[PDB]
Ligand binder design. Sequence first.
Ligand SMILES: CCCNC(=O)N1CCN(C(=O)c2ccco2)CC1
Length: 121
Amino acid sequence: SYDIQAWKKQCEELLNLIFQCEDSEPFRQPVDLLEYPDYRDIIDTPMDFATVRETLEAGNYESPMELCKDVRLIFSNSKAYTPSKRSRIYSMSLRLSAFFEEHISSVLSDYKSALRFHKRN
Ligand SMILES: CCCNC(=O)N1CCN(C(=O)c2ccco2)CC1
């Protein structure tokens, strides 16, 4: 269980589960500005799950903490852009965030444990 590289395939599997969740539908592609004309007046750094998957598959994440920061940005952008807490799309973001956090905690713990074991001497 001290495999330093194991997080990558664990993150690919978790992204597959997020793409099967109906709650991911608003977050699978960059927000469309035609529909939401004020989006970049509110959101400095757009993020979505296809961008996360492509960054992972390009080999452009060094750690699962970096992937986790980008996924958390999807959720903080939804909270910043929502006009109410009683919003459909923001409500979907909260359920999807709880699912993501429940599954990513072991991926982070195992990676950090593997790196500590690598430095143990
Ligand atoms: C994949 C389809 C493109 N997604 C898309 O247009 N949006 C998802 C992100 N948005 C929000 O987080 C939000 C919160 C409240 C209202 O929208 C804006 C709309």
